[PDB]
RNA sequence: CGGGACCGAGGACCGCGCUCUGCAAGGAUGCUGGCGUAAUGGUCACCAGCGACCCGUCUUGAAACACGGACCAAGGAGUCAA
RNA sequence: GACUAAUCGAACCAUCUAGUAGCUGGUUACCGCCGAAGUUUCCCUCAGGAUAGCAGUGUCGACCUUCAGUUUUAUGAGGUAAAGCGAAUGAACUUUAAAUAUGUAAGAAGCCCUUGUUACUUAACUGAACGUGGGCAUUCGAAUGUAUCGACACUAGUGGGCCAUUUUUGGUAAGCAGAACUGGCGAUGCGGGAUGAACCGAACGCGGGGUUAAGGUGCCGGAGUGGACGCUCAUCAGACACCACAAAAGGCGUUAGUACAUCUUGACAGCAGGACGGUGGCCA
RNA sequence: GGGAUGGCUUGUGGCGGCCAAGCGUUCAUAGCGACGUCGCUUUGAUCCUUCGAUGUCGGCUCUUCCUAUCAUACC
């Protein structure tokens, strides 16, 4: 993995495969997740999922 | 122009790296003309 | 696998004396109890200095103590976790109450002749178990031949 | 425009003089002036290799250097925060003094009455004819 | 390519001070789901009107269901597809009960006969052929013939793959 | 509301609780059968299924080449002083 | 350059002597905790050196201060696409404005105001620097993360190696050769590519259960002779192809299309018939 | 002490000009371009012009394979 996606995954606390986190959607977070898209799956969770 | 930090530290105040090549050229020309004048003086003596 | 760019760091300070002195072991037990069961920061600093090596406990002289006994400190109990030495350049020793790890013979004699008191650290623990009204003093750490050569 | 030691400048080689130039790396870079001459200025730039930054020093002719606006936003915000906080203390009401990132858009309704949508094919038929 | 649905996707450019009421653009997209439908919408809009996803918004996404899924229909599809030569026009016909079934049959057909994958195919028009005389292809014309009736010779009977051995030789007559 | 698998760490009480005479609530108990010995368990030899290059050295980036090794016992190489 | 006791371009014996080698070979129990590296910068090179960087043990200091191979915001570089020119003007047009990564900045350790001096500078007490005093804590002035601090001491290997993506500069008949970043390997096991330095998945304490990735499910072989619509018949098909052979190549193989054209005013294929006169046109 | 180019190759020249179906282009009419062609490289002659080993091949015996077929067979 290149160092910038590695750093973004570290700052998102996604250090192991099948780790999941909650993110509040701002532009400053959306661009980060857009960069690490070759490693993650994300979406909009409902109340049952939460 | 990339410049060495040590060379810029040793550089005199007010002078620039943009005149270094002209400095070396002036030095070489001065040495050559000194040799030429010595040859002229010896030939005049002969 | 887990990507851990940062590394967990093991402790880089002494947790126990390297010395095999039995009385120092008893002192360490006592101040472990005091620094666990009190809130006073004095006891924790004293315990840490009881752990330390000799280059980390430089001697404190009587002239250094007399310098720090000025300006409202004349009644505070002086606490040193190293050796207290005598300074023969200091002709007049003031009255002082000093608790130290050990004293030289001349330093103890001159303090008692000036009318002060010398204490061990366990007597200090008995009389001031929270370090109230004390002056904690260290000697010059970098005043060593090797440290000059660094 | 004369410069001073400590000023922040940008480096931009302009025109046909950027043809076969030996140092393409410093074009578009920004640094601090350490040395000033009449026709050229000395700039400290940092190049970041592996984990660490290293310092480079370059000499740039003045026509390829402009003063930079790196701290302009910070100074403007410091001044506006001071004056907004003074006004807030005068009026007895709190105010926002921190920037926030852009938020997701909220719910709204779009009318259709005068703005009927135009159906688009993947290729416009006007181009096909 | 997949269980497709037909979606009406309407989008617009984000309103500005100069343009408080931007124009709305509608497309019909065949897509497996809504995420793919909106992505295809922005792809085509970028190709046509130069409206980007970041500078626009989706106004509506709706499912367009077939009006009469129990009625057999003939469909004409005008498409363009990309190959090593370039872009080629093609008109083809499908006999189905819905537009989505016609489009799925088109995708499987283009894959089978020309190796054209999903992203190389642009669907331009899907029309229901109103009259029998509008059918052009002989492979649909033979199916719309009067009093159509055929037998089924040489039918392999359905035997479970878990029954390995049979005591009688099977027949291919029904 | 059924059907199946693997597991039972801890060892007085304390806690959060609940459907509160009590409980499925900070980790398994209750009932029953055969046997009480090579039956369980273990070691060795062998067959079977799957897995599995000969060690050490050297070289470079690595392999390959090359070198040493018939077998066993005992001996065998970072010591002492300033 | 023969012979001088199987010894001769300098005999044999003992000693100095355990002579020297930078070259070759070898260098002896176990477990645990960490763990690398290949022009960075300088020196006349090869028979070259240092050195940065990367590591480990000890400590000590308030382990205080927060910082960060990341986004956002302002502003540079890339104005480059794009829209319009019922805006002006005409990639070099612009109101506006790309994707990719990228530089600089984002606080109380800060921001200004005032006071004077100046040995700077300015026409200049003018800017700037130097100090002086004061105002600003009403929110400490983006997000996310933060067992990530600092300083010493001592010790060690490696410090112009291989492969690859991307970018860039040159080339060849074809090969390819330099740089820069990043990843991998040398130091590394496991699952799959039948097999294997460089491929794909995934990184490793000892076990039980569950679920997957890459890859697979006719047999070898765990899992489908699984479902839908088509295509293909090869005198060694094809099944991990992309490069070469190799062309605007050759095919009376087989399908799907596009364009032009003919057609009940009878097309296309045939069969029955016509195929004539000036005229044996001129020259040879 | 250290060592001991390769799915290459085959039958048809190079340089220069021209033509050229086509490819491009049709706010520029440039550029590429198979098939070809044209220039350079003794009336059956002369025999009075042999143009540089750094690179190494052989022979004997004997077996087998390829086909790119000299002979035998068919066409």
């Amino acid at each position: 993995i290149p160092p910038k996606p590695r750093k973004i995954l570290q700052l998102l606390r996604l250090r192991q495969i099948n780790n999941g986190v909650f993110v509040k959607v701002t532009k400053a977070t959306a661009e980060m997740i857009k960069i690490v898209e070759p490693w993650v799956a994300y979406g909009y969770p409902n109340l049952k999922s939460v | 122009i990339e410049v060495s930090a040590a060379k810029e530290a040793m550089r005199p105040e007010g002078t620039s790296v943009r005149g270094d090549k002209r400095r070396e050229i002036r030095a070489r020309v001065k040495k050559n003309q000194k040799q030429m004048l010595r040859n002229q003086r010896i030939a005049a003596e002969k | 696998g887990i990507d851990l760019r940062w590394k967990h760091v093991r402790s880089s300070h002494r947790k126990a004396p390297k010395s095999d002195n039995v009385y120092l072991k008893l002192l360490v037990k006592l101040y472990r109890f005091l620094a666990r069961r009190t809130e006073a920061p004095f006891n924790k600093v004293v315990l840490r200095r009881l752990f330390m090596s000799r280059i980390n406990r430089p001697p404190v002289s009587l002239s250094r103590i007399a310098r720090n006994l000025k300006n409202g400190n004349e009644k505070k109990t002086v606490v040193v976790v190293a050796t207290v030495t005598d300074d023969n350049r200091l002709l007049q020793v003031p009255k002082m109450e000093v608790a130290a790890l050990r004293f030289t013979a001349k330093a103890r004699a001159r303090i008692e002749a000036a009318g002060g008191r010398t204490l061990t650290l366990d007597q200090l623990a008995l009389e001031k178990p929270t370090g109230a009204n004390t002056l904690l003093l260290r000697g010059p750490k970098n005043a060593r031949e090797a440290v000059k050569h660094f | 425009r004369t410069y001073r030691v400590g000023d922040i400048v940008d480096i931009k080689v302009n025109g046909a003089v950027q043809k076969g130039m030996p140092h393409k790396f410093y074009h578009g870079k920004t640094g601090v002036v350490y040395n000033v001459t009449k026709s050229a200025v000395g700039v400290i730039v940092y190049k970041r290799v592996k984990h660490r930054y290293i310092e480079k020093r370059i000499n740039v002719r003045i026509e390829h250097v402009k003063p930079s606006r790196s701290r302009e936003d910070f100074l403007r915000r410091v001044k506006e925060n001071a004056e907004l906080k003074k006004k807030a203390k005068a009026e007895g009401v709190p105010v926002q003094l921190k920037r926030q990132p852009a938020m997701p858009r909220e719910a709204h309704t779009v009318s259709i009455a005068d703005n009927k949508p135009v159906t688009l094919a993947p290729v416009a038929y006007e181009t096909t004819i | 390519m997949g269980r497709l649905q037909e979606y009406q996707v309407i989008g617009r450019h984000l309103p500005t001070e100069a343009n408080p009421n931007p124009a709305l653009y509608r497309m019909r997209i065949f897509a497996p789901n809504e995420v793919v439908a909106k992505s295809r919408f922005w792809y085509f809009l970028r190709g046509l009107k130069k409206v980007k996803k970041a500078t626009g918004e989706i106004v509506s996404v709706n499912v367009i269901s077939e009006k009469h899924p129990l009625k057999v229909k003939n469909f004409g599809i005008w498409l363009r597809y990309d190959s090593r030569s370039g872009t080629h026009n093609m008109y083809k016909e499908y006999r189905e009960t819905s537009r989505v079934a016609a489009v799925e049959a088109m995708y499987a057909d283009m894959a089978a006969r020309h190796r054209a994958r999903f992203r190389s195919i642009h669907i331009l028009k899907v029309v229901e052929l109103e009259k029998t005389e509008d059918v052009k292809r002989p492979y649909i014309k033979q199916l719309v013939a009067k009093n159509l009736s055929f037998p089924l010779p040489h039918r392999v009977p359905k035997i479970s793959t878990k029954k390995i051995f049979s005591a009688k030789r099977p027949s291919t007559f029904s």
Side-chain angles (χ1 to χ4, degrees), chain A, chain B residues 1-6 8-9 11-12 14-46, chain C, chain D residues 2-18 20-129, chain E residues 1-16 18-49 51-174:
Chain A
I1 179 168
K4 171 192 291 191
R6 192 197 323 141
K7 229 277 180 177
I8 298 174
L9 284 176
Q10 153 204 335
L11 294 176
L12 290 172
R13 311 185 300 164
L14 299 177
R15 322 184 80 97
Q16 190 182 18
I17 186 171
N18 299 341
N19 288 2
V21 287
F22 286 111
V23 180
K24 168 180 182 181
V25 176
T26 70
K27 191 169 188 179
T29 51
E31 304 302 321
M32 272 164 107
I33 307 172
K34 264 153 205 72
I35 298 173
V36 281
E37 278 183 358
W39 294 268
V40 301
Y42 67 103
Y44 318 139
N46 59 2
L47 176 70
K48 177 182 184 171
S49 299
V50 172
Chain B
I1 300 175
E2 292 87 64
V3 293
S4 169
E8 289 325 276
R11 176 167 307 279
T15 54
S16 185
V17 77
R18 311 252 165 188
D20 285 349
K21 288 200 166 186
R22 302 272 194 169
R23 270 183 279 281
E24 291 138 334
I25 283 184
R26 260 175 280 111
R28 290 194 229 94
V29 168
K30 183 182 180 181
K31 183 186 181 189
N32 185 254
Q33 308 318 114
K34 186 169 188 174
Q35 290 172 340
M36 177 291 279
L37 290 172
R38 175 188 177 276
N39 275 333
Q40 276 192 351
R41 287 196 310 272
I42 290 175
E45 293 164 352
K46 293 180 177 178
Chain C
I2 180 137
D3 176 38
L4 298 179
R5 181 251 183 270
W6 318 106
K7 176 190 174 191
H8 294 312
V9 187
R10 187 188 54 190
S11 146
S12 63
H13 301 74
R14 273 189 180 185
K15 298 173 176 176
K18 288 276 193 175
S19 167
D20 287 327
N21 192 345
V22 282
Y23 299 101
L24 179 63
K25 289 181 178 183
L26 294 179
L27 259 180
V28 162
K29 285 188 173 181
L30 165 72
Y31 265 98
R32 277 191 202 279
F33 181 80
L34 281 173
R36 178 170 53 84
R37 296 289 311 278
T38 68
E39 62 307 313
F42 176 88
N43 299 331
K44 298 175 176 56
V45 177
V46 163
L47 177 62
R48 278 212 57 233
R49 293 184 189 176
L50 286 173
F51 294 155
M52 276 157 177
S53 68
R54 192 187 279 189
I55 61 159
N56 292 315
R57 294 177 287 105
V60 172
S61 97
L62 296 180
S63 79
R64 173 174 293 253
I65 294 177
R67 167 198 178 96
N68 292 279
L69 278 163
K70 305 178 181 184
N71 302 333
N73 291 351
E74 301 68 13
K75 309 150 307 323
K76 296 193 176 185
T77 297
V78 181
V79 182
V80 165
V81 202
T83 309
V84 165
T85 56
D86 175 40
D87 196 354
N88 53 51
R89 301 165 302 188
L90 176 65
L91 301 188
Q92 225 81 54
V93 180
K95 185 166 110 102
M96 35 164 99
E97 196 182 290
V98 183
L101 195 56
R102 53 175 298 258
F103 292 85
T104 70
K106 267 207 289 143
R108 183 189 311 273
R110 287 193 75 191
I111 288 177
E112 262 143 38
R117 195 156 68 102
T118 77
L119 289 80
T120 61
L121 296 187
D122 63 317
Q123 287 162 351
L124 173 74
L126 272 188
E127 283 167 16
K128 319 264 200 167
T130 57
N133 190 55
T134 56
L135 178 61
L136 186 56
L137 292 185
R138 269 184 289 193
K141 179 185 183 179
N142 285 352
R144 250 212 301 148
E145 176 65 59
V147 185
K148 290 184 173 187
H149 288 331
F150 285 165
Chain D
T2 207
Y3 298 98
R4 291 129 308 280
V5 176
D7 301 345
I8 316 182
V9 286
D10 317 290
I11 300 136
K12 175 181 171 171
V13 197
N14 35 293
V17 75
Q18 199 183 11
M21 206 189 33
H23 318 123
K24 296 296 179 54
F25 167 79
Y26 302 95
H27 172 91
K29 253 67 175 193
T30 301
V32 183
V33 165
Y34 71 93
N35 177 69
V36 189
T37 313
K38 162 195 171 183
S39 82
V41 92
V43 186
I44 296 170
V45 156
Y46 293 102
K47 187 173 332 202
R48 185 209 188 314
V49 48
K50 297 298 299 173
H51 43 299
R52 46 173 205 143
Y53 297 86
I54 75 142
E55 172 180 324
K56 294 292 193 178
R57 287 166 176 259
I58 49 176
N59 187 262
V60 198
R61 293 177 57 83
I62 292 321
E63 70 262 43
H64 316 115
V65 152
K66 297 172 182 180
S68 72
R69 309 165 60 183
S70 298
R71 302 243 312 170
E72 175 203 313
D73 198 23
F74 169 63
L75 297 180
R76 182 193 66 78
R77 290 194 333 269
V78 163
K79 180 181 179 181
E80 268 128 21
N81 279 355
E83 73 70 359
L84 252 49
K85 175 189 299 185
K86 179 184 311 300
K87 170 186 293 318
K89 202 171 185 181
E91 298 182 355
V93 277
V95 79
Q96 170 92 245
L97 293 180
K98 272 188 165 190
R99 321 164 265 179
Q100 303 297 318
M103 290 300 129
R105 273 176 288 115
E106 313 277 26
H108 62 279
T109 299
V110 174
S111 209
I112 216 182
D114 40 314
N115 203 15
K116 177 183 179 180
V118 182
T119 298
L120 270 38
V123 171
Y125 300 136
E126 196 58 74
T127 83
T128 72
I129 189 53
Chain E
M1 317 258 156
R3 186 42 20 71
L4 300 173
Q5 294 229 253
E6 198 176 15
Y7 298 89
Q8 167 191 257
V9 186
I10 299 172
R12 73 169 180 179
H13 187 278
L14 284 172
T16 56
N19 200 353
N21 217 55
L24 305 167
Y25 295 112
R26 170 184 175 273
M27 317 182 86
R28 304 170 69 113
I29 312 289
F30 293 95
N33 56 77
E34 267 204 8
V35 185
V36 184
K38 286 182 295 174
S39 173
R40 294 304 282 173
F41 176 81
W42 284 122
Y43 175 83
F44 293 136
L45 250 200
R46 179 161 47 260
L48 292 155
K49 293 290 185 178
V51 178
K52 290 168 298 306
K53 180 185 176 179
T55 74
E57 96 191 283
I58 297 296
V59 181
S60 190
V61 173
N62 303 79
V63 168
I64 316 174
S65 294
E66 191 75 14
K67 287 187 174 180
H68 302 278
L70 297 164
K71 191 232 301 180
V72 183
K73 297 168 284 287
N74 305 309
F75 289 94
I77 294 185
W78 169 28
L79 62 104
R80 289 184 175 170
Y81 86 105
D82 284 309
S83 73
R84 43 192 254 280
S85 172
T87 307
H88 323 282
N89 254 335
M90 263 170 114
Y91 173 69
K92 281 177 149 293
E93 291 179 349
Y94 301 92
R95 187 161 161 91
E96 300 281 348
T97 58
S98 62
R99 297 166 51 86
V100 282
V103 164
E104 302 198 11
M106 191 267 326
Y107 275 127
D109 192 29
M110 282 321 284
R113 297 194 136 104
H114 299 281
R115 266 76 206 195
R117 284 153 191 41
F118 178 83
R119 64 296 308 151
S120 68
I121 297 170
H122 284 165
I123 311 173
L124 266 41
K125 232 166 207 294
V126 174
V127 294
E128 178 182 343
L129 302 176
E130 313 137 5
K131 308 174 181 178
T132 309
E133 59 185 273
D134 296 349
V135 171
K136 308 303 176 187
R137 299 300 177 191
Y139 51 84
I140 310 289
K141 288 247 66 182
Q142 68 171 358
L143 291 174
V144 298
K146 185 186 173 184
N147 295 129
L148 182 71
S149 166
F150 48 85
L152 297 173
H154 199 86
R155 291 192 80 195
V156 179
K158 293 281 159 13
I159 310 167
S160 60
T161 64
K162 308 300 155 54
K163 190 188 181 186
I164 303 303
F165 304 110
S166 173
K168 185 214 253 173
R169 303 194 88 103
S171 298
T172 61
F173 315 112
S174 50

